[PDB]
Amino acid sequence: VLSEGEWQLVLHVWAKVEADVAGHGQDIHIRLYKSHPETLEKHDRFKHLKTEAEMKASEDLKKHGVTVLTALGAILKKKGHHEAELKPLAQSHATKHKIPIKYLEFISEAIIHVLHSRHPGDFGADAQGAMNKALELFRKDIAAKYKELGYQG
């Protein structure tokens, strides 16, 4: 659905994410929890992290962010051909964690915010539009997998 040029813009900025996955992941989660506080309630082990410095120093949160972004990067590198990578994520997020698609919108907003904050010269309007399209495709396809598992979130 994305053009090849759009995928190239997505993967160009993703290579910059991969220079510091941990740091990008922490900034994305800090942004997510600040912008949309309801999302932190899904994480029991992160609730005692009350300040930004605590969140940055938390190995548990840091490792979680790398897990999250690694999964997302592997999906993005498939350029839409991602059923195999996407199914297990849908399974856990639909049936165990119970993450509504709206929360996937919230973290998508945080990803775009952090990428622009860190890489404005590599993340202008066309690259933002390409990343938005890629994350829209991800959210569309994961919502279809949610429903196949019986989850309407």
Residue spans of beta strands (DSSP E) within the chain: none
Restricting to residues 44-73, name those near ligand HEM by CB under 6 A. 64, 67-68, 71-72
Q: Which one, 5 or 102, has the nearer CB to ligand HEM?
A: 102
Residue 67 and residue 25: Cα distance in Å, rounded? 9
Q: Give yes or no for a contact between 55 and 67, defined as CB atoms under 8 angstroms apart.
A: no
Residue 58 and residue 104: Cα distance in Å, rounded? 23
Residue 25 and residue 61: Cα distance in Å, rounded? 9
Figure out which of the listed residues 61, 76, 99, 131 binds ligand HEM, where binding follows CB under 6 A.
Answer: 99
Restricting to residues 20-49, name those near ligand HEM by CB under 6 A. 39, 42-43
Give least dist CB 64 to ligand HEM, A: 6
**Type of residue found at 3:** S
Q: Which residues bind ligand HEM (CB under 6 A)?
A: 39, 42-43, 64, 67-68, 71-72, 89, 92-93, 97, 99, 103-104, 107
